[PDB]
Amino acid sequence: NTLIFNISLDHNADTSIEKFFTVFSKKLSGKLNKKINVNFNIVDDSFTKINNIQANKADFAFVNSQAIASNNWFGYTPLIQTLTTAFKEDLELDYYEDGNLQKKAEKTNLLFLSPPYKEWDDIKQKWTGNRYDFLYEPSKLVSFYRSMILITGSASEITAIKKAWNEKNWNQFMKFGIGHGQTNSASRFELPDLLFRKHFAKNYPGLQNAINSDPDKFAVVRGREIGINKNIKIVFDDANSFSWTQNIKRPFYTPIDPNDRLEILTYSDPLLYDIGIVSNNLSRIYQKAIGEIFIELAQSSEDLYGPSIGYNGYKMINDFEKEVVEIIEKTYG
Numbered sequence: 457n458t459l460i461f462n463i464s465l466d467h468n469a470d471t472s473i474e475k476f477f478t479v480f481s482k483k484l485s486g487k488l489n490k491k492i493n494v495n496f497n498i499v500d501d502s503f504t505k506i507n508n509i510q511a512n513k514a515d516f517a518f519v520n521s522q523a524i525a526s527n528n529w530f531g532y533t534p535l536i537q538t539l540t541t542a543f544k545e546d547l548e549l550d551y552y553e554d555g556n557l558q559k560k561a562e563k564t565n566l567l568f569l570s571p572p573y574k575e576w577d578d579i580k581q582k583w584t585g586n587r588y589d590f591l592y593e594p595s596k597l598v599s600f601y602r603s604m605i606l607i608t609g610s611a612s613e614i615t616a617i618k619k620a621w622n623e624k625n626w627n628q629f630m631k632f633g634i635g636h637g638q639t640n641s642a643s644r645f646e647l648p649d650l651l652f653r654k655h656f657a658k659n660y661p662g663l664q665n666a667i668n669s670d671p672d673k674f675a676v677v678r679g680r681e682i683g684i685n686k687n688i689k690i691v692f693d694d695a696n697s698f699s700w701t702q703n704i705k706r707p708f709y710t711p712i713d714p715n716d717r718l719e720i721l722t723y724s725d726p727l728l729y730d731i732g733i734v735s736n737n738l739s740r741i742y743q744k745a746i747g748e749i750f751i752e753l754a755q756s757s758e759d760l761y762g763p764s765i766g767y768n769g770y771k772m773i774n775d776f777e778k779e780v781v782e783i784i785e786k787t788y789g
């Protein structure tokens with residue numbers, strides 16, 4: 457018997473990926489009293505992964521939490537919630553109506569600016585091979601993440617960007633240039649979009665409508681490349697992306713003027729971290745076994761894949777509605 461997983465590689469996962477599956481296979485064969493070999497295909501996009509499983513081309517994969525449902529007819533079942541190590545200034549899940557999104561960003565700025573990213577060192581900033589450990593609370597796992605909005609520019613520009621924000625003047629704000637991702641990206645499009653609807657009120661048309669209405673004021677820009685394109689001084693990213701983006705001696709997260717600033721304006725509402733889904737072509741017993749093997753590797757610190765992509769733990773999902781859907785509903789409505 458043989459299974460097929462879909463897997464994404466980040467950092468140096470590829471150097472240990474084969475052994476991880478040799479291990480996984482071993483443990484799965486033990487649990488199931490059978491010789492079972494687990495192969496993998498490398499796949500990046502959640503919708504391809506989901507489509508593969510629904511097409512009986514794959515048995516298991518981790519996918520964006522907002523891309524799935526728990527539905528008897530879908531051909532897969534949500535199996536495990538991935539967990540990630542909390543960031544220091546964000547141990548607790550909360551929303552815009554809790555007032556802490558901007559203030560959490562401010563606290564994080566304190567840790568992040570001095571020293572500046574470009575001077576970060578593997579030893580001083582405690583690079584683990586996957587992340588700069590000085591930004592995390594290793595004794596704490598959480599099941600959520602957020603988007604963040606980075607801003608950059610001269611000292612007076614940064615003051616004008618913040619001014620526009622606090623006054624809730626959308627047209628003034630957008631005129632600084634906004635860098636985004638694909639329209640189906642939570643961190644680089646949807647979460648920022650939702651945050652604006654909550655923050656800006658009437659004057660907000662929605663992000664896509666704004667882009668159509670004034671294309672020159674928007675562009676696709678990665679957070680790590682902010683400042684590179686003048687004309688775009690506001691950029692969306694996964695919250696605290698610099699934490700797992702290794703500074704290697706232009707530098708990332710670094711303006712093209714040493715006098716210019718770069719900081720986090722605010723965070724977005726939260727979303728659940730990725731979820732492992734499993735094919736319904738497998739018996740419930742096989743499904744649970746797969747899930748347990750992940751949980752157990754994490755508990756024994758023998759998981760050599762998870763951490764490479766921010767999966768520092770796992771837990772079983774027992775009530776998807778309560779544990780997933782109701783959480784997502786507070787962010788998306």
Ligand SMILES: Cc1ncc(C[n+]2csc(CCO)c2C)c(N)n1
Binds near residue numbers: 586
């Ligand atoms: C160590 C590490 N931490 C976080 C990420 C980014 N990431 C991986 S899965 C996920 C949630 C769904 O987007 C995010 C933000 C990474 N690549 N590596």
